[PDB]
Design an enzyme around this catalytic site. Structure first.
Site, PDB file in Angstrom:
ATOM      1  N   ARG A 144      -8.468 -14.994   1.065  1.00 31.75           N
ATOM      2  CA  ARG A 144      -8.740 -15.708  -0.176  1.00 31.75           C
ATOM      3  C   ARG A 144      -7.888 -15.237  -1.339  1.00 31.75           C
ATOM      4  O   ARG A 144      -7.813 -15.941  -2.350  1.00 31.75           O
ATOM      5  CB  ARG A 144     -10.204 -15.580  -0.586  1.00 31.75           C
ATOM      6  N   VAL A 145      -7.248 -14.082  -1.236  1.00 27.14           N
ATOM      7  CA  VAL A 145      -6.459 -13.591  -2.352  1.00 27.14           C
ATOM      8  C   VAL A 145      -5.040 -14.121  -2.214  1.00 27.14           C
ATOM      9  O   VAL A 145      -4.296 -14.182  -3.198  1.00 27.14           O
ATOM     10  CB  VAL A 145      -6.506 -12.060  -2.424  1.00 27.14           C
TER      11      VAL A 145
END
Ligand SMILES: Nc1ncnc2c1ncn2[C@@H]1O[C@H](COP(=O)(O)OP(=O)(O)O)[C@@H](O)[C@H]1O
Ligand SMILES: [Mg+2]
Lengths: 45, 54, 503, 54
Positions: free
Chosen positions: C366-367
């Protein structure tokens, strides 16, 4: 390994000799020190 | 004060010493505790390349 | 001998003091109902008279359920249980580095005692929204697939989920073996202190693991924490909290640290044993309710700290196995829900031929691009989009639905990048060689080159670039971005090497 | 110093120090560079007569 196994032999013989002597040691200064310790915890309690 | 050897050891003391020393003999081979050897002198031999004609 | 004498007779105080105790009821199977401790506090380390700790949970008006730290033969009914006086704690230092430490603090590896200085409570509260700041540093693993599709951030948690025997511990040890080149370097920001918490494994796997790390010279980042199978269920329960507390020590001092929680499902099943022996009601798959709260504490102990709080980071990566690939089981849904990054191995690609066997589209970070270097971001986004296109077109054109030039282009580039992402075991490479080889794969020059020949292309290409292009890789890794002169130079070198590859 | 303080075996540490720090071994020789350079000169001479014929 020499100092390790000599250390283990030493520590086990020390514990066994302590059991051998203090298992047959009574002269009531044990109980005297213990009542002194209850007295000391009484003074600090 | 009970010096002059490890105290009251019994034979299985030395037996455990011998098994541990035997595994320690296994972890290097059959060398000596003094005057170490260096190597066995090998020789890199690269074959000469040749040609009939260019 | 004499120093041993004097340390034995001066070290123990033998300072007797009046102390709260309580006799023992049923000592069942590592659980002990203890009657009497009316001032014990919840989840406290307490001490059985034979010299062994236990942890007091499940405070009830009848009795306290103390669950023992070890063997059960050494406890009878009717013996004393002395309160230690504090919550269970882990001795943490930087002299704990490179030493296998049994789950509390007790270094069972035969290299003397631990020279600890900073005791730390193990059940601490994780930092809030203000002490945390976001991921910034690119946590590199050396795996091409991880660092090019699911990159890690120094500041982050990212699962390694799969089924049994897929390469998950091997991915974790690739991640460990990569970071040697950052420890022995110059920047403190690059340096690594990692904690490998092996939960519920066997002792010979941890022994051969320490063999691989010592032979790879890993023992200055590493802190191996083994709570193996023969250890009690609270030692397996409490071990990843210990590794988290050591990681929190390094983080709050301001050193970039990580923790690999190997076989985190073993913590889940040991805590299932503990709850079912302490007679708590069972929930789902006989796991109790708060297993999510367990792993949620354990995994939200890690994110990047604020610039006024030292700047140290923590990278939690827990390894979790499913059974028959069932992601819908209780522990995988809980531990996917708490984490954000997750690397999915399906196993059919392990037997099909790609190594490490990330089967992929299930896996997500997700980063994302925030945790990459600038070069890898400039190169490997079109690679991920192309792999998505390739997967869906191969999935509907399994039989040859429609083959124009575009579909054979998609399958060609997809198969070639699939053989790019193959990588051998225990061989991590740096970021600059990854930028070079994914540049040689994505930016043309490999699209029509016989997909069985990609591996020899890898070997000869890395040999070429490590042979006479070390200063240019230094320019790439130190300048950050891959510059335009370096871009056209990589174009020229891959073209020259395409000639030397068709030579 | 560290291995002398650790190994309490007297004589052995200074013995290995003397036999190791005064141990020298030569580079393994070639006897092929002369052949390679002479064959180089011969193919250069044949290449020079090929040069003048061209
Ligand atoms: N990059 C790789 N190349 C070759 N083999 C690999 C690679 N990664 C993993 N493996 C294989 O994975 C196996 C180890 O799996 P492991 O990580 O121990 O899974 P688990 O911990 O679930 O048992 C080894 O047999 C090894 O051959
Ligand atoms: Mg594993």
């Amino acid at each position: 390994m020499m100092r390790q196994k000599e250390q283990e032999h030493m520590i086990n013989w020390v514990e066994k000799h302590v059991v051998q002597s203090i298992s047959a040691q009574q002269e009531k200064e044990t109980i005297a020190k213990c009542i002194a310790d209850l007295k000391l915890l009484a003074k600090k309690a | 004060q009970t010096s002059g050897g490890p105290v009251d050891a019994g034979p299985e003391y030395q037996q455990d010493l011998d098994r541990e020393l035997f595994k320690l003999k296994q972890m290097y081979g059959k060398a000596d505790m003094n005057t170490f050897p260096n190597f066995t002198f090998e020789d890199p031999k690269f074959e000469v390349v040749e040609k009939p004609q260019s | 001998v004499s120093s041993i004498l004097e340390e034995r007779i001066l070290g123990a105080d033998t300072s007797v003091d009046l102390e709260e105790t309580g006799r023992v009821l049923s000592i069942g199977d590592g659980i002990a109902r203890v009657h009497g401790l009316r001032n014990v506090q919840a989840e406290e380390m307490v001490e059985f008279s034979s010299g062994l700790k236990g942890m007091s949970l499940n405070l009830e008006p009848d009795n306290v359920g103390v669950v023992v730290f070890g063997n059960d033969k050494l406890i009878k009914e009717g013996d004393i249980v002395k309160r230690t006086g504090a919550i269970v704690d882990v001795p943490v230092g930087e002299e704990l580095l490179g030493r296998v430490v049994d789950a509390l603090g007790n270094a069972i590896d035969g290299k003397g005692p631990i020279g600890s200085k900073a005791r730390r409570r193990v059940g601490l509260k994780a930092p809030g929204i203000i002490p945390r700041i976001s991921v910034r540093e690119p946590m590199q693993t050396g795996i091409k697939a991880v660092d090019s599709l699911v990159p890690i951030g120094r500041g982050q948690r990212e699962l390694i989920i799969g089924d049994r025997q897929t390469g998950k511990t091997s991915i974790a040890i690739d991640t460990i073996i990569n970071q040697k080149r950052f420890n022995d370097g110059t920047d403190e920001k690059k340096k690594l202190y990692c904690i490998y918490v092996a939960i519920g494994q066997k002792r010979s796997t941890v022994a051969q693991l320490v063999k691989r790390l010592t032979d790879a010279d890993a023992m200055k980042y590493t802190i191996v924490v083994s709570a193996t199978a023969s250890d009690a269920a609270p030692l397996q329960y409490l071990a990843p909290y210990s590794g988290c507390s050591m990681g929190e020590y390094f983080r709050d001092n301001g050193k970039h640290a990580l923790i690999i929680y190997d076989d985190l499902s073993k913590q889940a099943v040991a805590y299932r044993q503990m709850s079912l022996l302490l007679r708590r009601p069972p929930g789902r798959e006989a796991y109790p309710g708060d297993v999510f709260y367990l792993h949620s504490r354990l995994l939200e102990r890690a994110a990047k700290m604020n610039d006024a709080f030292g700047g140290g980071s923590l990278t939690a990566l827990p390894v979790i196995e499913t059974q028959a690939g069932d992601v819908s089981a209780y522990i995988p849904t809980n531990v996917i829900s708490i984490t954000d990054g997750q690397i999915f191995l399906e196993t059919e690609l392990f037997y099909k031929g790609i190594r490490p066997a990330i089967n992929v589209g299930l896996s997500v970070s997700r980063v994302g691009s925030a945790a990459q270097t600038r070069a890898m971001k400039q190169v490997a986004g079109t690679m991920k989009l192309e792999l998505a296109q390739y997967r869906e077109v191969a999935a509907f054109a399994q039989f040859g639905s429609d083959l124009d030039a575009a579909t054979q282009q998609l399958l060609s580039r997809g198969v070639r990048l699939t053989e790019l992402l193959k990588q051998g075991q225990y061989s991590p490479m740096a970021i600059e060689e990854q930028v070079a080889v994914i540049y040689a794969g994505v930016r043309g020059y490999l699209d029509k080159l016989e997909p069985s020949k990609i591996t020899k292309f890898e070997n000869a290409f890395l040999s070429h670039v490590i042979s006479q292009h070390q200063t240019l890789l230094g320019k790439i890794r130190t300048d950050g971005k891959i510059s335009e002169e370096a871009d056209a130079k990589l174009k020229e070198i891959v073209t020259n090497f395409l000639a030397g590859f068709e030579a | 110093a560290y291995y002398k303080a650790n190994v309490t075996k007297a004589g052995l540490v200074d013995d290995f120090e003397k036999k190791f720090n005064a141990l020298k071994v030569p580079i393994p020789e070639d006897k092929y560079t002369a052949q390679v350079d002479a064959e180089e000169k011969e193919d250069v001479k044949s290449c020079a007569e090929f040069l003048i014929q061209s």
